[PDB]
Amino acid sequence: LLGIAVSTDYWLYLEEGIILPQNQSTEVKMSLHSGLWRVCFLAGEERGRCFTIEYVMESTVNVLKMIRSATPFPLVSLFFMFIGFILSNIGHITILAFVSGIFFILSGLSLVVGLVLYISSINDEMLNRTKDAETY
Amino acid sequence: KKPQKSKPGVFSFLDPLAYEIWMCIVFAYIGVSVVLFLVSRFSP
Amino acid sequence: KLSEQGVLDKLKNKWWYDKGECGAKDSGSKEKTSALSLSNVAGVFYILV
Structure with missing residues (x-):
């Protein structure tokens, strides 16, 4: 699941638009799904750029920065599982299996810190959006 | 620019107490344990 | 002739009152407190992990 979890551009959701007050549905200005490597837009001028973050393009840019x-803790997460996965097979072919379980334990500690850095930094720019009444 | 809510730091949870009080907690934590050890020394 | 009775003055009352206000109207009851962010308590997890 983690190789699927890294490789997609569907880690989150975004919808920035302006609302209409008097009994009218919303007008979406920008909407996109994204990941960490590439970003594939959904409703920004109807543009199909599966677009990297190192190239720029106003607030969601700084969200993407x-x-x-x-970045690093999901990448470290892959290496400790993969060492621990193959050492479980070499132990079948013990200490080969015991320490590999610790690499499964040391993995998920970086999964939490990975989810700590991910969710909290989104919550940073969640509030660091300039709050207007019309912009839902 | 009129400020909105500023971003709290990672050590913002200990905000409602000064640094001296958290410090005096720890030095209270040490010596009371020393007293408990020393009372347990001079008593069966 | 303007300054002796305040045609300068009384019109400066009106045009500076005219365009709306942004004062104590929205400091008092244009807020509701939210749920805590994780970022309010994120550093405990750094102390935890």
């Missing part, structure tokens, strides 16, 4: 801070 903070997801670069959430």
Whole structure:
């Protein structure tokens, strides 16, 4: 599941638009699903750019700059499972299996810190959006 | 620019107490344990 | 002739009152407190893990 979890551009959701007060449905201005490597837009001018973050393009850009801070701990998470997965097979072919279980334990400690850095930095720019009445 | 809610730091949970009080808690924590050890020394 | 009775003055009362206000109207009851963020208590997890 983690290889699927890293490789997709569907880690989160975003919808920035402006509302209409008097009994009228909302007008979406920007909407996109994204990941960490590529970003594939959904409703920004109806543009199909599966677009990297190192290239720019106004607030969701700076949101995307903070997801670069959430990079390393999912990448470290892959290596400790993969060492622990193959050492479970070499122990079948013990200490080969015991320490590999610790690499499964040391993995998920980085999963939490990975989810700590991910969710809290989103909550940073969640409030750091300039709050207007019309912009839902 | 009129400020909105500023971002709290990672050590913002200990905000409602000063640094001296948290410090005086720890030095209270040490010596009371020393007293408990020393009372337990001079008593069966 | 303007300053002796305040045509400068009384019109400066009106045009500076005219365009709406942004004062104590929204400091008092245009807020409701929210749920805590994780970022309010994130550093405990850093102390935890």
